[PDB]
Amino acid sequence: VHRMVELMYVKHEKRWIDPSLKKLTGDFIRRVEERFTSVEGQPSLLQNYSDLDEPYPAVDRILAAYPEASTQLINA
Amino acid sequence: PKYLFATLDKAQYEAYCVKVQARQKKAYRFFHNGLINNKLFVAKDKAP
């Protein structure tokens, strides 16, 4: 999730190379969410992609609510 | 297991503890790669 942001959002200009690529990074995030939730009902911490506008600030917050997401590698 | 580890030093034990978790990540990668692609078993052809 971090490397996606690094390579599609230019820090010193505060812009995504294209809204679509923001959506991309956003979607995979959602995915990582689902991978690590195991009860129904809990909503997403990324309810609107508006959040990824200033990404690096808010991304860390979402990645935070899913501890293990920093512990284990991508499921094949 | 704890009782074996009580033979060492926090030195050794905590150095082994790092090797272990590196393995667990190769093992984790393998298992998921193998479940999907049907290769939890790799038959060896040539000897070493």
PDB file of C-alpha atoms in Angstrom:
ATOM      1  CA  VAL A   1       0.000   0.000   0.000  1.00  0.00           C
ATOM      2  CA  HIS A   2       2.871   2.331   0.892  1.00  0.00           C
ATOM      3  CA  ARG A   3       4.903   1.640  -2.250  1.00  0.00           C
ATOM      4  CA  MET A   4       1.798   2.299  -4.357  1.00  0.00           C
ATOM      5  CA  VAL A   5       1.463   5.731  -2.812  1.00  0.00           C
ATOM      6  CA  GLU A   6       5.212   6.345  -3.228  1.00  0.00           C
ATOM      7  CA  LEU A   7       5.074   5.658  -6.962  1.00  0.00           C
ATOM      8  CA  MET A   8       1.754   7.279  -7.923  1.00  0.00           C
ATOM      9  CA  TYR A   9       1.569  10.311  -5.635  1.00  0.00           C
ATOM     10  CA  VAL A  10       4.257  12.981  -5.961  1.00  0.00           C
ATOM     11  CA  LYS A  11       4.942  14.186  -2.420  1.00  0.00           C
ATOM     12  CA  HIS A  12       6.346  17.649  -3.128  1.00  0.00           C
ATOM     13  CA  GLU A  13       3.421  18.578  -5.375  1.00  0.00           C
ATOM     14  CA  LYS A  14       0.603  16.957  -3.406  1.00  0.00           C
ATOM     15  CA  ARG A  15      -1.048  15.395  -6.466  1.00  0.00           C
ATOM     16  CA  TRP A  16      -1.784  11.979  -7.921  1.00  0.00           C
ATOM     17  CA  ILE A  17      -0.444  11.296 -11.412  1.00  0.00           C
ATOM     18  CA  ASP A  18      -4.091  10.574 -12.265  1.00  0.00           C
ATOM     19  CA  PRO A  19      -7.338  10.173 -10.266  1.00  0.00           C
ATOM     20  CA  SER A  20      -7.552   6.587 -11.546  1.00  0.00           C
ATOM     21  CA  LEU A  21      -4.237   5.582  -9.940  1.00  0.00           C
ATOM     22  CA  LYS A  22      -5.555   7.038  -6.690  1.00  0.00           C
ATOM     23  CA  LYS A  23      -8.571   4.796  -7.060  1.00  0.00           C
ATOM     24  CA  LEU A  24      -6.218   1.893  -7.677  1.00  0.00           C
ATOM     25  CA  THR A  25      -4.212   2.381  -4.495  1.00  0.00           C
ATOM     26  CA  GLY A  26      -7.531   2.999  -2.741  1.00  0.00           C
ATOM     27  CA  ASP A  27      -9.079  -0.257  -3.927  1.00  0.00           C
ATOM     28  CA  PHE A  28      -6.153  -2.471  -2.983  1.00  0.00           C
ATOM     29  CA  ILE A  29      -6.280  -0.812   0.445  1.00  0.00           C
ATOM     30  CA  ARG A  30      -9.903  -1.850   0.754  1.00  0.00           C
ATOM     31  CA  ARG A  31      -8.731  -5.320  -0.229  1.00  0.00           C
ATOM     32  CA  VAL A  32      -6.134  -5.407   2.534  1.00  0.00           C
ATOM     33  CA  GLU A  33      -8.953  -4.352   4.809  1.00  0.00           C
ATOM     34  CA  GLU A  34     -11.155  -7.280   3.847  1.00  0.00           C
ATOM     35  CA  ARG A  35      -8.259  -9.716   4.087  1.00  0.00           C
ATOM     36  CA  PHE A  36      -7.818  -8.773   7.730  1.00  0.00           C
ATOM     37  CA  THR A  37     -11.399  -8.388   8.917  1.00  0.00           C
ATOM     38  CA  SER A  38     -13.277 -11.558   9.873  1.00  0.00           C
ATOM     39  CA  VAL A  39     -16.672 -10.406  11.136  1.00  0.00           C
ATOM     40  CA  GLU A  40     -19.470  -8.849   9.128  1.00  0.00           C
ATOM     41  CA  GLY A  41     -20.828  -5.385   9.802  1.00  0.00           C
ATOM     42  CA  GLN A  42     -17.637  -3.406  10.376  1.00  0.00           C
ATOM     43  CA  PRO A  43     -17.520  -0.626   7.772  1.00  0.00           C
ATOM     44  CA  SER A  44     -14.468   0.547   5.811  1.00  0.00           C
ATOM     45  CA  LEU A  45     -12.039   3.121   7.191  1.00  0.00           C
ATOM     46  CA  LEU A  46     -11.816   4.346   3.618  1.00  0.00           C
ATOM     47  CA  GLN A  47     -15.444   5.119   2.889  1.00  0.00           C
ATOM     48  CA  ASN A  48     -14.630   7.765   0.263  1.00  0.00           C
ATOM     49  CA  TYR A  49     -11.541   8.023  -1.940  1.00  0.00           C
ATOM     50  CA  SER A  50     -11.588  11.708  -1.079  1.00  0.00           C
ATOM     51  CA  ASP A  51      -9.290  10.655   1.783  1.00  0.00           C
ATOM     52  CA  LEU A  52      -6.409   9.701  -0.472  1.00  0.00           C
ATOM     53  CA  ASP A  53      -6.184  13.334  -1.611  1.00  0.00           C
ATOM     54  CA  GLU A  54      -3.779  13.929   1.248  1.00  0.00           C
ATOM     55  CA  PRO A  55      -2.884  10.224   1.358  1.00  0.00           C
ATOM     56  CA  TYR A  56       0.285   9.591   3.322  1.00  0.00           C
ATOM     57  CA  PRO A  57      -1.371  11.284   6.378  1.00  0.00           C
ATOM     58  CA  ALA A  58      -4.603   9.222   6.353  1.00  0.00           C
ATOM     59  CA  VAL A  59      -3.325   5.944   4.846  1.00  0.00           C
ATOM     60  CA  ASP A  60      -1.213   5.246   7.933  1.00  0.00           C
ATOM     61  CA  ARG A  61      -4.385   5.577   9.984  1.00  0.00           C
ATOM     62  CA  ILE A  62      -6.238   2.850   8.041  1.00  0.00           C
ATOM     63  CA  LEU A  63      -3.210   0.551   7.938  1.00  0.00           C
ATOM     64  CA  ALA A  64      -3.136   1.084  11.687  1.00  0.00           C
ATOM     65  CA  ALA A  65      -6.560  -0.437  12.378  1.00  0.00           C
ATOM     66  CA  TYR A  66      -5.305  -3.649  10.821  1.00  0.00           C
ATOM     67  CA  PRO A  67      -2.192  -4.548  12.839  1.00  0.00           C
ATOM     68  CA  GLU A  68      -1.098  -7.755  11.155  1.00  0.00           C
ATOM     69  CA  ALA A  69      -1.184  -5.958   7.787  1.00  0.00           C
ATOM     70  CA  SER A  70       2.358  -4.901   8.585  1.00  0.00           C
ATOM     71  CA  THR A  71       3.323  -8.297  10.003  1.00  0.00           C
ATOM     72  CA  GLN A  72       2.624 -10.715   7.128  1.00  0.00           C
ATOM     73  CA  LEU A  73       3.193 -10.741   3.363  1.00  0.00           C
ATOM     74  CA  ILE A  74       0.684 -10.740   0.497  1.00  0.00           C
ATOM     75  CA  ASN A  75      -1.460 -13.850   0.293  1.00  0.00           C
ATOM     76  CA  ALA A  76      -0.451 -15.449  -2.990  1.00  0.00           C
TER      77      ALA A  76
ATOM     78  CA  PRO B   1      10.139 -25.754  24.143  1.00  0.00           C
ATOM     79  CA  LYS B   2      10.683 -22.991  26.727  1.00  0.00           C
ATOM     80  CA  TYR B   3      12.814 -25.411  28.833  1.00  0.00           C
ATOM     81  CA  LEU B   4      15.263 -25.932  25.968  1.00  0.00           C
ATOM     82  CA  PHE B   5      15.562 -22.177  25.456  1.00  0.00           C
ATOM     83  CA  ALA B   6      16.390 -21.871  29.154  1.00  0.00           C
ATOM     84  CA  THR B   7      19.811 -23.388  28.318  1.00  0.00           C
ATOM     85  CA  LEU B   8      20.957 -20.354  26.373  1.00  0.00           C
ATOM     86  CA  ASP B   9      21.513 -16.656  26.835  1.00  0.00           C
ATOM     87  CA  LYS B  10      19.022 -13.963  25.872  1.00  0.00           C
ATOM     88  CA  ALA B  11      21.937 -13.405  23.522  1.00  0.00           C
ATOM     89  CA  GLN B  12      21.502 -16.655  21.603  1.00  0.00           C
ATOM     90  CA  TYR B  13      17.785 -17.178  22.032  1.00  0.00           C
ATOM     91  CA  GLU B  14      16.983 -13.714  20.661  1.00  0.00           C
ATOM     92  CA  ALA B  15      19.323 -14.288  17.720  1.00  0.00           C
ATOM     93  CA  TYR B  16      17.547 -17.567  16.915  1.00  0.00           C
ATOM     94  CA  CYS B  17      14.176 -15.837  17.342  1.00  0.00           C
ATOM     95  CA  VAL B  18      15.042 -13.709  14.316  1.00  0.00           C
ATOM     96  CA  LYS B  19      16.058 -16.610  12.070  1.00  0.00           C
ATOM     97  CA  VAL B  20      12.806 -18.409  12.899  1.00  0.00           C
ATOM     98  CA  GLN B  21      10.527 -15.547  11.806  1.00  0.00           C
ATOM     99  CA  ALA B  22      12.412 -15.173   8.530  1.00  0.00           C
ATOM    100  CA  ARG B  23      11.703 -18.852   7.826  1.00  0.00           C
ATOM    101  CA  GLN B  24       8.035 -18.471   8.750  1.00  0.00           C
ATOM    102  CA  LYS B  25       7.802 -15.901   5.980  1.00  0.00           C
ATOM    103  CA  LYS B  26       9.400 -18.112   3.338  1.00  0.00           C
ATOM    104  CA  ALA B  27       7.219 -20.952   4.577  1.00  0.00           C
ATOM    105  CA  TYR B  28       4.161 -18.699   4.468  1.00  0.00           C
ATOM    106  CA  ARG B  29       4.964 -17.636   0.910  1.00  0.00           C
ATOM    107  CA  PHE B  30       5.486 -21.223  -0.171  1.00  0.00           C
ATOM    108  CA  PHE B  31       2.290 -22.630   1.317  1.00  0.00           C
ATOM    109  CA  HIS B  32       0.034 -20.036  -0.310  1.00  0.00           C
ATOM    110  CA  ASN B  33       1.854 -20.283  -3.615  1.00  0.00           C
ATOM    111  CA  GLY B  34       1.507 -24.077  -3.364  1.00  0.00           C
ATOM    112  CA  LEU B  35      -2.183 -24.177  -2.341  1.00  0.00           C
ATOM    113  CA  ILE B  36      -3.100 -22.110  -5.373  1.00  0.00           C
ATOM    114  CA  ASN B  37      -0.791 -23.777  -7.909  1.00  0.00           C
ATOM    115  CA  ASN B  38      -0.854 -27.337  -6.545  1.00  0.00           C
ATOM    116  CA  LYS B  39       2.802 -27.633  -5.615  1.00  0.00           C
ATOM    117  CA  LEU B  40       3.070 -28.304  -1.908  1.00  0.00           C
ATOM    118  CA  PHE B  41       4.971 -31.303  -3.262  1.00  0.00           C
ATOM    119  CA  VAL B  42       7.930 -30.826  -5.552  1.00  0.00           C
ATOM    120  CA  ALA B  43       9.449 -34.033  -6.801  1.00  0.00           C
ATOM    121  CA  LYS B  44      13.220 -33.846  -7.123  1.00  0.00           C
ATOM    122  CA  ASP B  45      14.554 -34.992 -10.493  1.00  0.00           C
ATOM    123  CA  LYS B  46      18.354 -34.798 -10.366  1.00  0.00           C
ATOM    124  CA  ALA B  47      20.307 -35.358  -7.142  1.00  0.00           C
ATOM    125  CA  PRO B  48      22.405 -32.462  -5.748  1.00  0.00           C
TER     126      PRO B  48
END
